Symmetry: C3
Subunit: 432 residues, 3 copies
């Protein structure tokens, strides 16, 4: 019986009674792939127009609205757009008189269709539009949505049931120690390694060549990591949005001298202010937007400060308990298992069902694509295992492998299982 402490740093080693060297530190986990995450990025554009446009769209407003921002914002999430008539046509035109701008602008929309809201804004300052001989004309357009910038999108994998792996060389023999498997064979005995507890759940931020950054925790959306993209926009299949979503932005036409400008817009609020033109029949637009969560996320900067290059592990040391004890040699079945069926999902957080027939002549130390799922006595077995690998599944008892039958879906498919995505439609018929 002997005892020694082994430090956890590279190069750490003990020589007596048996040479033990710390080869490295890694980890095991049950992966939960969340798909794509990004910040809620409110973006706004518009124009102050000394005219009553007949086509309220990016192409129809091309003479005033910035081209690239309009197209990008138009394609965003929870789009909101308003067209305000500040001073309409006094005579002539085509559905451009003040009478066509009723609340909601249904009269204008009849002749000039648009996906945007149309509202009267008579009474608001028209000072920004000048240089007209008789009839002063003015309108304001505002457009805002939650835009998905590719550089701000991150792939996130949650690591559950985390086990720190202390890679040891015990008298030249490889031994990977964890809280689950803390024993190593020594030349004529056994080494039991006392290890610190596991670090709990980890967050793997995958940047895109491909690089992984690490968070320690769930994460905690109520602490210093509140601005994590995990706390924001969630797309399980990196295409469709699910769960918590901000409301459509609230667009407001605010005059330059309005006392409201002494305060800041709230989250999702967009305040637009016409700017007096230096040129005749032209005007600028000042836009004030309240970002979601009260701040704009800077992706490379957030990742650099809120993550580490490697997963965290406790400082140690490890307690090396050397014993003269030798484990009892048990006979094991080396033949492959038969009629193995795998059902459920992988990298999803819900254990998959693994069932089959273990062969005779000992316990089958079952592996599913090399993943340890436990040992089973001969005959029928059933287990619930958290799988990290996709199908097809190669099943073995430690010897030759066989192909299992599988009905296993991916994490993105699991995220959409048990739900009917999109618009729910219903019809109310006329009475008989």
């Amino acid at each position: 019986e002997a005892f020694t402490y082994l430090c956890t740093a590279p190069g750490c080693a003990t020589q007596t009674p048996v040479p033990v060297r710390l080869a490295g530190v890694r980890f095991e986990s049950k992966i939960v792939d969340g798909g794509c995450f990004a910040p809620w990025d409110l973006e706004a554009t518009g124009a102050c127009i000394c005219e009553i446009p007949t086509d309220v769209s990016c192409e129809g407003l091309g003479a005033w609205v910035p081209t690239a921002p309009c197209a990008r914002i138009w394609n965003g999430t929870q789009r909101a757009c308003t067209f305000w008539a500040v001073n309409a046509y006094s005579s002539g035109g085509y559905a451009q008189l003040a009478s066509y701008f009723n609340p909601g602008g249904s009269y204008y929309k009849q002749y000039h269709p648009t996906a945007c809201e149309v509202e009267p804004a008579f009474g608001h300052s028209d000072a920004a539009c000048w240089g007209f001989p008789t009839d002063t004309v003015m309108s304001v357009f505002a457009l805002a949505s939650y835009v998905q910038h590719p550089h701000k999108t991150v792939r996130v994998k949650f690591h559950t049931e985390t086990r720190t792996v202390w890679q040891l060389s015990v008298a030249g023999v490889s031994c990977n120690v964890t809280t689950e498997h803390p024993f190593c064979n020594t030349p004529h005995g056994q080494l039991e390694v006392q290890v610190p507890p596991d670090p709990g759940d980890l967050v793997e931020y995958i940047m895109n060549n491909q690089q992984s950054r690490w968070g320690l925790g769930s994460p905690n959306c109520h602490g210093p990591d509140w601005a994590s993209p995990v706390c924001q926009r969630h797309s399980p299949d990196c295409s469709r949005l699910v769960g918590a979503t901000p409301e459509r932005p609230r667009l407001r036409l605010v005059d330059a001298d309005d006392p409201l400008l002494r305060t800041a817009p709230g989250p999702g609020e967009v305040w637009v202010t016409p700017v007096i033109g230096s040129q005749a029949r032209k005007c600028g637009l000042h836009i004030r937007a309240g970002p979601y969560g009260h701040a704009t996320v800077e992706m490379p900067e957030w990742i650099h400060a809120h993550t580490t290059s490697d997963p965290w592990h406790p400082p140690g040391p490890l307690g090396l308990k050397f014993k003269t004890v030798r484990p009892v040699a048990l006979p094991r079945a080396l033949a492959p298992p038969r009629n193995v069926r795998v059902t459920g999902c992988y990298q999803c957080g819900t254990p998959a069902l693994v069932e089959g027939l273990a062969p005779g002549g000992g316990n089958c130390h079952l592996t599913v694509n090399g993943e340890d799922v436990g040992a089973f006595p001969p005959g029928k077995f059933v287990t619930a295992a958290l799988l990290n690998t996709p199908p097809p599944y190669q099943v073995s008892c430690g010897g030759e492998s066989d192909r299992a039958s599988a009905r296993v879906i991916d994490p993105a498919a699991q995220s959409f299982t048990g739900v009917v995505y999109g618009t729910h439609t219903t019809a109310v018929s006329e009475t008989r």
Copy 2:
């Protein structure tokens, strides 16, 4: 000293030096009862009406609006309803002219009160209503709320401080090993069981009665995002608490409006009149954006996102056989005196347990059979997470006594430290 690995599957057994059989696998935990959970289920109804109704309510609109959906939706959470006047009376009537439909409809509501919003919709297509000889009349009603379907409601218990229980039989003698209690007695020695770590928190989804299991908090940011736990929370299965969606945004959208090229957002309800096959009648097409961008199918979600049993690591267990025998310590068997229990049970906040431990040794205290620790004779005080409701039977290992209790249930705890409902205030004249 001897060592052997014991697998964790049914039928697993070792024979030397003393036989150890894996009898079963269960778990211990500190229960946190969350009450009732359900998805945020947006439901909408309405009618296209070739008339200007004077009573905007389920009964008042009975001739057009479907009866059962109206009554159910009207009683829902965060109800929203709008009555649009598309084409009003040209003459006569009673507060039915276009002039009564000012924005917000205050003039109409003065003579025809309603809990619904009233708005003008002049300029919208009235083509759906035909067959009028001199005065075409049209109105549209839309009603939406977050409805509670009983089949979608689940009872949820969170399991904290989870301890996997490896039920062993050591030469016929029952031994329940956990990370807290890993020692067993063997005929002539002691068995120390090396066990894997505990699985962390569990989620128990209670159907109807059947229990289904989730592993985790749950994680509302991953594949289990649509869990009812991530949605509507009712601690007492009656009153709603916490995060709630806004009232639905109802919009009258004409069949040819370019807005129909896009999908409604979460909580948005777009209604479109459908031309009648009969004179002075019309239909209504409803497009609703569900909360979270998808409609939850309860039996289907539960089947794919839960297991029949709680998860446990694959093992094996490390059986360390020792010739060591534990030192016999004196135990007090008399019941504890003047025991007081204060706080809550199945709530997540440890309850205060205080009393007097009797003489003759340490009192291995149990509260309704739950182990709360051992105490030396005299005054004791402990903070224990209780899983059982009052009354509390207290024992030191022998006879039991009735403790005095001021313990509330999880639903009562959820409403403790808060004043529920509408906050009313009066501003008096100077």
Copy 3:
């Protein structure tokens, strides 16, 4: 070898083979300082006015609106205010006729600027305003926001990687056992303590003098602790708000006989009702507000029922394993480490980078302001450590200490790192 169970209560002790006494129970953790937390406290005020005021502000409405509530609510978070004209001037006045109250009140605002919304309310009952000789005049003002009451604000520290510390006295010799360090040296040989698992994450609620209250968990915002201020208003620097925020309150003028009053207002909704006056040209106002989360949080009461005076620990007992085995004597470097640099943050949840040069003579059992960060062989070292102490950092191998160079920020600074706070402004120029 010998074995005995040791209970975890005060007064617990074992006599044989070596006397062991339970001296106390404490804990170690990696602190995550969240800053300030408070409930979302919706507060509303207003007035029923038998006049058409020309200044819609707290001072301008001083003759009708309660002074202290107006000033407090005006300075609140996500402020909303509406001025409704129920019955305007029939003649005369200054931008007070019905024609100035178009939807949105732009005509009125042109002459009478206000940060509040202005809306017509003609058609609503004006019965509350009576005793006018010829021209009946009536308006209604409502104001609401999320107010920060100092007594409702709590400082919160999240405790991660929690380790219960069982303080023992092994024959008068102090030994602090944890799941990380369960061994005690004895003259016989060694005492190995079998301990229960750690309790998981803790929540430390700091009141005010200064008192700490304890929660067990993350917390769970979906269970009985749903009303925790942690689940509500978050201010990392106890000044600026971040994350999830309710919408601006939805103010509505609701007549006394409106069927809407048979239902309760939703969260963030404020319904105002004029009350018929006993005095001529005067009226009262009844306010119905739907609190955030469907209930108003009572801070001392919530804390008393949802927290404990001390952090929770399992009941035990501890398994005392007495061995004749003596640990192997390893050489330790006692000289201070050289060129130590510390980069990152402390009490933030992100491990800081610690790098330097370990001296000769054995392994350097490195401490950063007394915090154990591991042992390193002589030479260059690099480690990722969760730090609980602020800079400056005193570094030691177990002997004399040296001053490390540091670029370490506080938890409030970390919360604002990687973000640009406030209003995002953009200008669209003329072509």
